Amino acid sequence: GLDISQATTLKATLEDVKIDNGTVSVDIVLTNANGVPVTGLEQYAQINAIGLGIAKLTPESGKGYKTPQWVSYINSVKAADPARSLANYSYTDGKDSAGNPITKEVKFTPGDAIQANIESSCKTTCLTVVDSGVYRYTFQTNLSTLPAIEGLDLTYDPTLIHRITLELQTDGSKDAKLVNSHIDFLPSDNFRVAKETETRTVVDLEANCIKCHSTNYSDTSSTAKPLALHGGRRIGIANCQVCHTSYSKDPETGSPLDMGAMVHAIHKGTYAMVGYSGTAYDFSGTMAKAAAESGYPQYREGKDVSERVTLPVSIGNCQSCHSTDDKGPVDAASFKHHKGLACASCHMSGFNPVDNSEWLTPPEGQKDRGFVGNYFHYYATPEIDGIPGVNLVHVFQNGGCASCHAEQGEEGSAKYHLAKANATKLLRTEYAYKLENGTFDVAKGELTFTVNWHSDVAPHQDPKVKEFWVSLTAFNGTEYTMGPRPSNGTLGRSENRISVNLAKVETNANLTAVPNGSKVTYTLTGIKAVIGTSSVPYKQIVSIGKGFMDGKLLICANSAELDPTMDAAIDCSNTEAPIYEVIVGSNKASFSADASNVTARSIVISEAKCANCHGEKADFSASHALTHAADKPDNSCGTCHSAVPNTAVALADGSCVACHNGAPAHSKKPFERGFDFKVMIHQIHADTRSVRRLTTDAATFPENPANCAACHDKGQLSLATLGNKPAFLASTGEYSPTVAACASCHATTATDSAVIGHFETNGGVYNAAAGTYTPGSETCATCHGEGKSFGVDKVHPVKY
Ligand code: HEC
Ligand code: HEC
Ligand code: HEC
Ligand code: HEC
Ligand code: HEC
Ligand code: HEC
Ligand code: HEC
Ligand code: HEC
Ligand code: HEC
Ligand code: HEC
Ligand code: HEC
Ligand SMILES: O=C(O)CN(CC(=O)O)CC(=O)O
Ligand SMILES: O=C(O)CN(CC(=O)O)CC(=O)O
Ligand SMILES: O=C(O)CN(CC(=O)O)CC(=O)O
Ligand SMILES: O=C(O)CN(CC(=O)O)CC(=O)O
Ligand SMILES: [Ca+2]
Ligand SMILES: [Fe+3]
Ligand SMILES: [Fe+3]
Ligand SMILES: [Fe+3]
Ligand SMILES: [Fe+3]
Ligand SMILES: [Mg+2]
Ligand SMILES: [Mg+2]
Ligand SMILES: [O]
Ligand SMILES: [O]
């Protein structure tokens, strides 16, 4: 075999478990990546950790099925550190309806607490070499001799599935010589290995977490952000689960460490605890807020972390983390079954049994169901719930018990949790439509196009259709340009874009609709512009005469319809029922003088990649809430500013770039918060945007932003034609296209004149007077295109 001092990689497998009079040993088969046995561990002077944990999977019971939970045999009661036992605080946030400031309160329950843990300190003392690269670890901890801990049943039970975990790290290695392994087994059947269906998994790193998280553990770059915890040494889910048990808490706050409770609260932006070395980790951002507003001496800028997690899906999007397609963990359906801490971790944010001790007692003549039970059964309200508007007590009283208490194979609360997502899918499928190409008679000012609609009840005849926008945008074959803001026009107030609501034919004097069974042919008139040096409505649509048409249909759905065999679509004017909107996009059709295709804009990012984090078909109307958000997109300022809706759907086909391009109209922003699509999206996700319109909180991007493959596919960054695009004209000056693309991270201001000179040396312009750059001048591609001398794929920590 090979000496560990010379091994560049380690792998480790666990086997041959023995437990005898409470004495636990296990074999660690140590190899290199190539499978060569690695010798010399037991004497190696560069070992950072050898940590071995052991746990049993214990059953739970109550009404319905409850999933089994892990109990570590190794635990201890931690005292709180008094100086780091967090005080309660309050902070201002918004205003009530009368215009007075709302105060919010954050409350903690410091006090001693149990923490599960592993055996860490023994290391090589506990090892005996049994073979080449085979080391027997014999725990120092005896199962017969565990100190009693009040409330915990530590009794050894061979009939229960057990787990042992290993964390092994040498040479300070982030990856190559880091291992997390585990083995699950049934001691009472001769310590055989557990079947997938016998043990507890629930989530799987690959099926459930990597859609957002980097696992590039060896990432050496400055912006590295891999999902490795506790100094870098813990990376495997199975390892977390042995410490992060239902009964473990942080003594300094009272916060739960239970895996589900902690993970739900982190991604909801409510979790706060004090960790190693007394560092406070506040995932809400509110601690720093209160410090700045009121004073909060326990928050120490630069040491404690107080940042609001910005999750790119709703916290209600369970399928982001829990598999429903039977390609995840075999016990993925665990998320359908009630578990106090899990249910509480969203619905009871900020509540605890001290500050809300009333809930410890059920109402006169009701059964006591515990703190969380009583909340769900008795005390919850829409005003106080961790999910505003949710009415659990209404479900308890009116929805029957099976709404939350599920037998195996039933849906429980998933019936409610998945209802809008499921109906949304069905409705998109049922109302799917196609836009055929438009014929634009430009002298006549008239656009004709046919929609292939799902039925012979047309959009304007279907009261379940809220609106049906079709937007057309001029495209000159090179790149979209929004252009100056004109005076208002009948159809819109943009040079390059018109949005028309087809659901309102009868009241629109410019629109006529002619049904032919399921096909509806529309004719839009009044598309006329005097073409001059002046900005006028439809100026580009008229001078270019061709471009693309995109559909955004809004269907009203019934939030009270929970049964997927029923029709979830509902009359938009209905008053009984809470209604939500389902968005249905379309193909991107062309319009042109004869309705022939307009060659597609180049695709330079991947739709499926933005969906990894944002979910499929993410809507960004709410991103348009700052400025003139209530103006409709067929009406003056709303043409560009609307959030009701924003009229774009797809992310990677240029629909956003129709506006977000090199030529923002007016009230322009400077480069460091620029409007142009690549520049805006780079800056948001790299945290180089000087100001975000709708929040003071930087995005918490869960990948490395310098991992270009997070959004770009291999081949999309040749940069071959990029220099032929028009410059981005920001408030102060213009930036050539490759310069804008790169400087959106590398130079959002002229702070390093060397980097700015590099641009200018090689045909680029940076914050130059308008008109300076000539398309074709940038020579960037020759060195920075993928695969070149300094190719973007070579200089950046990419993971294709
Ligand atoms: C066209 C105007 C461009 C633009 C926009 C950029 N380059 Fe280059 N580049 C080259 C070399 C050898 C380096 C140094 C590499 C290293 O030190 O590891 C660079 C550097 C850059 C950067 C990074 C700057 C920073 O420190 O932030 C950026 C953003 C960049 N370049 C952009 C090589 C070349 C060329 C070789 C002939 C060509 C041509 C270009 N670069 C052109 C451009
Ligand atoms: C969600 C809105 C619920 C509804 C509807 C019902 N129950 Fe429930 N119950 C719920 C929670 C979140 C808890 C706490 C579980 C925990 O681990 O703390 C409970 C608790 C109970 C219990 C205790 C036993 C258990 O299964 O944990 C019982 C016996 C119980 N609830 C009964 C019950 C009945 C009879 C219901 C219909 C009348 C009912 N629950 C509805 C959540 C919800
Ligand atoms: C996008 C929808 C995500 C999915 C799916 C998962 N996580 Fe996540 N996580 C996400 C964000 C935006 C953040 C904050 C930014 C960051 O990466 O730090 C997090 C954070 C965490 C953390 C805290 C990391 C740290 O700051 O200490 C943990 C421990 C974590 N996420 C775990 C986790 C697990 C186990 C997931 C699969 C079940 C998972 N995340 C999915 C976004 C997203
Ligand atoms: C026991 C050896 C642990 C294993 C394995 C993992 N975690 Fe852990 N974690 C553990 C404890 C006892 C604590 C609280 C410490 C305290 O001072 O009270 C934590 C804390 C966290 C946190 C909060 C942030 C922090 O303190 O760094 C997170 C986000 C967390 N743990 C995540 C986590 C993950 C995802 C793990 C598997 C890869 C994991 N931990 C393993 C104990 C242990
Ligand atoms: C990633 C950020 C998550 C999203 C979004 C949701 N869940 Fe989750 N959940 C997540 C993890 C990592 C865990 C812990 C797994 C473990 O080892 O303990 C859970 C757990 C739950 C549970 C408990 C399951 C059990 O212990 O058997 C429940 C009941 C649960 N989750 C429900 C749930 C719902 C309904 C969600 C959408 C509204 C949801 N989770 C989102 C990670 C994440
Ligand atoms: C965050 C990850 C959640 C966890 C964990 C649990 N719930 Fe939940 N719940 C969540 C959201 C975002 C919503 C609203 C869903 C919607 O479409 O708007 C809900 C809703 C419910 C409901 C229905 C409430 C109502 O219609 O008024 C119930 C009955 C419910 N949740 C119960 C419940 C149970 C019992 C949980 C543990 C299994 C649980 N939730 C966890 C978010 C999250
Ligand atoms: C996970 C690694 C992501 C990938 C891949 C993509 N996005 Fe993203 N985005 C992510 C986070 C954590 C956030 C912060 C969310 C918040 O609520 O603040 C964002 C934000 C955006 C935004 C801004 C939304 C807003 O400020 O109104 C946009 C427009 C956006 N993301 C778009 C987008 C596109 C087009 C992507 C593929 C090219 C893409 N994102 C990928 C996380 C991640
Ligand atoms: C013109 C009809 C637009 C299209 C199509 C899209 N956006 Fe937009 N966006 C537009 C304007 C006029 C504004 C200014 C602010 C306002 O409230 O009107 C914006 C702004 C954004 C932002 C702001 C981000 C920030 O500055 O930090 C985001 C995140 C955003 N837009 C995203 C976005 C996406 C993802 C689009 C395609 C789905 C999209 N916009 C299209 C005008 C228009
Ligand atoms: C598209 C042709 C536009 C129409 C019509 C109107 N506005 Fe606009 N506005 C537009 C853009 C692209 C931007 C952002 C510029 C950038 O470089 O980021 C704006 C900005 C504003 C602002 C500043 C606040 C902001 O969100 O940046 C205001 C106050 C504003 N716009 C107002 C406004 C009014 C009153 C309009 C009708 C009279 C109007 N806009 C139309 C693009 C377009
Ligand atoms: C998602 C959060 C992204 C990350 C990570 C990176 N880029 Fe990107 N890029 C992103 C968007 C949404 C766009 C505009 C897409 C469109 O349809 O126009 C871009 C564009 C580019 C470009 C211009 C490519 C071209 O038009 O020929 C370049 C040169 C570019 N991006 C470079 C790049 C690099 C080197 C990255 C890793 C360090 C990288 N991007 C990350 C979104 C995202
Ligand atoms: C944010 C999404 C980025 C964009 C877009 C581009 N780059 Fe980048 N780059 C970024 C980071 C965070 C780093 C540091 C990575 C590290 O290893 O620590 C880099 C690095 C470079 C380098 C290496 C030389 C250096 O100056 O560090 C080069 C040569 C480089 N980047 C080039 C470059 C070009 C030409 C871009 C436009 C096509 C570009 N980058 C975009 C982040 C981001
Ligand atoms: O396909 C589904 O059933 C669910 N969708 C929505 C959609 O396709 O409209 C997201 C997804 O596939 O994860
Ligand atoms: O459903 C499809 O056929 C393809 N998808 C993504 C996917 O599910 O992988 C795009 C979408 O549904 O919008
Ligand atoms: O286009 C305009 O309306 C003129 N501008 C440019 C800009 O809005 O950034 C400033 C102005 O109103 O005089
Ligand atoms: O452009 C507008 O319509 C309003 N203005 C000033 C103005 O030019 O009158 C503020 C702004 O654009 O930020
Ligand atoms: Ca602590
Ligand atoms: Fe889908
Ligand atoms: Fe799909
Ligand atoms: Fe102006
Ligand atoms: Fe103005
Ligand atoms: Mg009409
Ligand atoms: Mg707006
Ligand atoms: O899908
Ligand atoms: O403006």
- Assign 3-class secondary structure to 534-545: CCCCCHHHHHHC
**Beta-strand runs (E) in 125-231:** 127-131, 134-142, 162-170, 178-186, 192-193
Method: X-ray
| Rounded CA separation 459/435 (Å) | 13
Residues in the chain: 800
| Rounded CA separation 272/109 (Å) | 12
Give the ligand with the smallest distance to the CA of 429.
12
CA of 422 to the centre of ligand 12 (A): 8
- For residues 398 and 549, the answer to whether their CB atoms sit within 8 Å is no
| Rounded CA separation 518/681 (Å) | 39
- For residues 149 and 75, the answer to whether their CB atoms sit within 8 Å is yes
Q: How far apart are the first and last CA of the chain?
A: 33
Report the run of H or E that residue 48 belongs to, with start and end: strand 47-58
Q: Which atom of ligand 6 is nearest to the CA of 260?
A: 5
Tell me the residues surrounding ligand 22 (ion) with CB < 5 Å: 624, 627, 629, 641
Whether residue 666 is annotated as binding a ligand: the answer is yes
Which residues, at least 6 apart from 388, have a Cβ–Cβ distance to it below 8 Å? 382
Q: Which two tokens stand for residue 718?
A: 């040749």
Whether residue 746 is annotated as binding a ligand: the answer is yes
Instruction: Please tell me the residue having the least CA distance from ligand 3 atom 34.
Output: 209
Decide: 250 in ligand 4 pocket, CB within 6 A. Answer: yes
Give the ligand with the smallest distance to the CA of 754.
1
Q: Which of these, 549, 540, 529, lies nearest to 480 by C-alpha position? A: 540
- C-alpha 184: how far from chain center: 31
| Rounded CA separation 213/227 (Å) | 6
| Rounded CA separation 431/582 (Å) | 10
Q: Ligand 6: which of 314, 417, 562, 563 to mutate, judged by most atoms within 8 Å of the beta carbon? A: 417
| Residue given tokens 């839009």 in the structure block | 524
Residue 135: what are its φ and ψ, rounded to 5°? -115, 125
Q: Which two tokens stand for residue 119?
A: 């055996």
Q: Which of these, 32, 30, 28, lies nearest to 8 by C-alpha position? A: 32
Decide: 494 in ligand 9 pocket, CB within 6 A. Answer: yes
